Amino acid sequence: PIKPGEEVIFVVPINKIKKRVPRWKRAPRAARFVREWIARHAKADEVIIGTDVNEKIWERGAEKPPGKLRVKVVVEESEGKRIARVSLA
Amino acid sequence: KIHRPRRGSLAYSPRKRAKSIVPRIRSWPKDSEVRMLGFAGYKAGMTHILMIDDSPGLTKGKEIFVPVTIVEVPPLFVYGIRAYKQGYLGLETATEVWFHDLHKNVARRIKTLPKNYNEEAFQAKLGQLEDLVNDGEIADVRLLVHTQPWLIGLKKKPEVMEYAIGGDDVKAKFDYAKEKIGKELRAGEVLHEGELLDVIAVTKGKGTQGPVKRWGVKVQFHKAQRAGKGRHIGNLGPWHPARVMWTVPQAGQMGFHHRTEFNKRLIAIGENGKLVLDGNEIEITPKGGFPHYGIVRSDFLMIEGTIPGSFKRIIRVRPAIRPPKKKPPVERPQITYVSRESKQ
Amino acid sequence: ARWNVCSYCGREFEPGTGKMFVRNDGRVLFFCSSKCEKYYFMGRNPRKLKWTKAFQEARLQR
RNA sequence: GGGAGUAGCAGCAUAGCCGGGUGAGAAUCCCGGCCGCCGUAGGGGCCAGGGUUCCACGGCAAUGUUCGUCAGCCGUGGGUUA
RNA sequence: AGCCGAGGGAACUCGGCAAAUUGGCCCCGUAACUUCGGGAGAAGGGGUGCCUGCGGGUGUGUAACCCGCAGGUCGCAGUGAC
RNA sequence: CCCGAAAACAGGCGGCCACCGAGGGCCCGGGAAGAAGACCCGGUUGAUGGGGCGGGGAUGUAAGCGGGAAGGGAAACCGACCCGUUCAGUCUGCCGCUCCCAACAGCCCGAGUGCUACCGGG
Ligand SMILES: [Zn+2]
């Protein structure tokens, strides 16, 4: 895993889920893909996605999200479950 | 009445998914030379050569374009010997002897292997079988073999097969097998360049397809294309018999079938990914790598033409069962150019 | 097995590939690809394209 | 009763996402931001016709082609000045 | 419900059904026949972008609208989409 | 050549367990397979997906900076566009190398009994 307090950099591939969905649904699906991906790879029970990340996902409309995101992740412990917070790099 | 032939063949029915992805061999050819009658490998790619024509016909003596498929063939491991006697209706297995020292990874395929089974017990069982063969009770001897796909980093699970042996004398066959058990086999020790081969594999999968593609039926008139029946057939049959006939073309599984393809020429056997010309050694792997595959590193066959199957798939090879009288001669043909350029 | 040269881009292409276009007056042209054929017939000028050899020769002409 | 936990809940305007809140319970209710649709009409004004559907507070058994803490639904009180 | 399609170009079909082609503006030029009004946008052919400069009409006007010329330059394509 | 042990004489052989438990399935990372099911490969005794570094490819020479440009202007300057930097820049539903991140944790199904007629030796 990765230890809390640390600032980690992740590249998320959205190319993958492109062409699974129709063009007009690509950005809303990219959001869910980001959440699932970071949960898997940070071993978190919750993910909180920053508004800046959402805005970068939706910059060019619903049809054209970026192919590769670079994101910063910080994990915190509270009450057991791990919580990951995502920002832009 | 207008006459015409029917749409598709009835000789490959039912058109179903293959039972196994490893192909079985139903018939064997008659070869006097006491050798193992086939080999197995993995498909890698296609390219082309230019060469001086050796086959009969006009264009003999001329330079010609020839397409080629490459099959990667690492060495097989001979792990067993099996004996067959004559039953009431047909052949029946009598006895098998397995070798005692097997590779770890063979348990991924054969989950329950013997435990103690020492060299001494092995020699005792081979003696039992030798005496059985000398008695006169035995009609055929065959080899049991497995692939080694860990030498090329493709897999760890092997494929297990049974091959036949050429000739007539059961005792001579058994002596061959006793020599070969517990040792590696290489394709050069079995095949001859310039031979004609038959090739056996499971075809590329396409899933459920309709009758335009599956049977080659005509697309209907543009009025029907606007009525909703463009890619349908017209009718399922006459009033009497008051049932649908099995011969009427319908939709279903297309591809992933067992097929045998006759009379493909072996043109060259290579070594450690290299081929020898008059003077120099050249890598057959093209710039950038074979697509949906990588780099050929062990040993390979050139087979001219096309063969069934996807790229990373198991292919079985045997000598030709149905060849013509006017054959090409069994020597490697004179090659002038081999394509090494990128294939993507 | 000899290597022909492309009439549009000036590079060599391998045996068993490409095309020969024959004019009725007899002039023969060789093309490595559909790209080059199509550009030559629609009228793009290769002396301004830096992926051709005519560019190098015209730079010498500057 | 079987048909059947099936057809239909597509086609003429394909629209949601992130963060926060309420609440027993939130794809479907509220705030902010991003992204979108109409834009000589899907905006503004107003006859006939309808008759309280208008407003505030409180609710969710039924109605709403899904859910619902929402409502032209349910209850309690109000509201039309020449 | 829509987009493209090599080589052929109606061989399809009761029937070119459906689809394709043409398309705005300026200049040139325009058949038979005719109730002399038309036919007629007949047909058919050329041109059209950006930048730099010159000129004209009305007007008091380096206000505003409209009409011509020459040169340079990029692209497969300048009524470049509609 | 294709299908083919439900071929009711419902088969033969080698091996494992049994008379807790061999073995199987779900779950996980994937695709050469795929309407649901099924098939195939891998799971730290590991290169399965991703990242990074390289290779092979597609298009066609980025932004910035500098220098020119038909002409105009008292002049500082304007100017579509051209040349250099620059086979560049952008991209990759292909290959290779490398454990940097994730293939963690588990949850279900599972054969045990004899009667008499025996069969070949106890
Ligand atoms: Zn060329």
mmCIF file of C-alpha atoms and ligand atoms in Angstrom, chain C residues 5-11 13 30-33 35-37 51-52, ligand 1:
data_model
loop_
_atom_site.group_PDB
_atom_site.id
_atom_site.type_symbol
_atom_site.label_atom_id
_atom_site.label_comp_id
_atom_site.label_asym_id
_atom_site.label_seq_id
_atom_site.Cartn_x
_atom_site.Cartn_y
_atom_site.Cartn_z
ATOM 1 C CA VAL C 5 12.362 4.293 -56.211
ATOM 2 C CA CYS C 6 9.289 6.445 -55.647
ATOM 3 C CA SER C 7 8.465 9.205 -58.128
ATOM 4 C CA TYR C 8 6.862 11.416 -55.452
ATOM 5 C CA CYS C 9 8.952 11.052 -52.276
ATOM 6 C CA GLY C 10 12.222 9.729 -53.704
ATOM 7 C CA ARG C 11 12.664 6.915 -51.189
ATOM 8 C CA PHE C 13 10.556 0.606 -51.498
ATOM 9 C CA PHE C 30 6.400 4.278 -59.639
ATOM 10 C CA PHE C 31 4.597 4.804 -56.326
ATOM 11 C CA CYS C 32 5.296 3.351 -52.904
ATOM 12 C CA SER C 33 1.868 4.064 -51.439
ATOM 13 C CA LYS C 35 -0.710 8.427 -50.046
ATOM 14 C CA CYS C 36 1.886 9.333 -52.672
ATOM 15 C CA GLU C 37 -0.318 8.364 -55.627
ATOM 16 C CA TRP C 51 9.556 14.476 -45.533
ATOM 17 C CA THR C 52 10.600 14.301 -49.209
HETATM 18 ZN ZN ZN G 1 6.507 7.903 -51.978
#
